[PDB]
């Protein structure tokens, strides 16, 4: 599997306000091909947000990354910090 | 719930070789205070490795980060790129 980790400068909303505002966005991610799950990350303290995504394959993950990076611009995000990694299943299974 | 995202330059082992080698390490992590789960990440083509961790609280996450970043020096890992984030539960539940 492929893990996508992303974060970026963000000035809010955070917490329950973020959940309410970005609910539609979250639901749309579920319709993405190859998508398995996502953990939403946020740090009001450091003014940043992002997410950890698990995709079935790298191609699916890269396609989403490019698209989401474009979309993020509509929220005022000019730079996205992201890394694409392979997941080590054996080790991950032990720690889950 | 606090999420820890870490990665760093790495020269190996990778894949099953990594799974066999670090298996003992994965078992000890399960014993760490406040530990919930970890996803092992790796990229042989980019010569990098790391992990995504979930801890019950920030102090537990920060305690482990301090301990782990120090231990990694033994594997030759001089520097580590780390980020500590809060998790948005509502949105994360939608995407799982």
**Alpha-carbon distances, residue B41 vs A11, A78, B9, B15, B60 (angstroms):** 29, 26, 12, 10, 21
- Token look-up 């890394």 returns A83
Contact A64, A25 (CB under 8 A): no
Question: Residue A9 in 3-state DSSP?
Answer: strand
Interface of B with A (CB under 8 A): 3, 5, 7, 15-16, 18-19, 22-23, 26-27, 29-30, 37-44, 48, 50, 52, 54, 83-92, 94-96
Using the structure block, give the residue that is written with the tokens 């594997």: B75
Among B3, B29, B42, beta carbon nearest to A95: B29
- From which experimental method does this structure derive? X-ray
CB neighbours of A64 closer than 8 A, spacing ≥ 6?
A4, A32, A34, A35, A53, A55
A39:B86 CB<8 A: no
HEC secondary structure over B8-45: EECCCCCHHHHHHHHHHHHHHHCCCCCEEEEEEEEECC
Could you list the residue range(s) of the whole structural domain that residue B58 is in? 1-96
Tally of domains within chain A: 1
- Inter-chain CB proximity B18 and A91 less than 8 Å: yes
Distance separating alpha carbons of residues A10 and A14, to the nearest angstrom: 9
| Two tokens, residue B91 | 């949105």
Three-class HEC string of A42-80: EECCCCEEEEEEEECCHHHHHHHHHHHHHHHHHHCCCCC
Distance CA(B37)–CA(B55), nearest Å, equals 7
Rounded to the nearest 5 degrees, what angle is found at the Cα of B47, between the Cα atoms of B12 and B1?
90
| Residue B35 φ then ψ, to 5° | -75, 135
| B37/B93 Cα distance (integer angstroms) | 16
CATH number for B49? 3.30.70.100
Distance from the Cα of B8 to chain A's closest Cα (Å) equals 11
């Amino acid at each position: 599997a492929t893990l996508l980790q992303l974060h970026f400068a963000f000035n809010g909303p955070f917490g329950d306000a973020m959940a309410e505002q970005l609910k539609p966005l979250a639901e749309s991610i579920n319709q993405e091909p190859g998508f398995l799950w996502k953990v939403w990350t946020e740090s009001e303290k450091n003014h940043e947000a992002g997410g950890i995504y698990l995709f079935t394959d790298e191609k699916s993950a890269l396609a989403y990354l490019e698209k989401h990076t474009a979309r993020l611009k509509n929220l005022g995000v000019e730079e996205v910090v992201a890394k694409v990694f392979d997941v080590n299943e054996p080790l991950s299974q032990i720690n889950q």
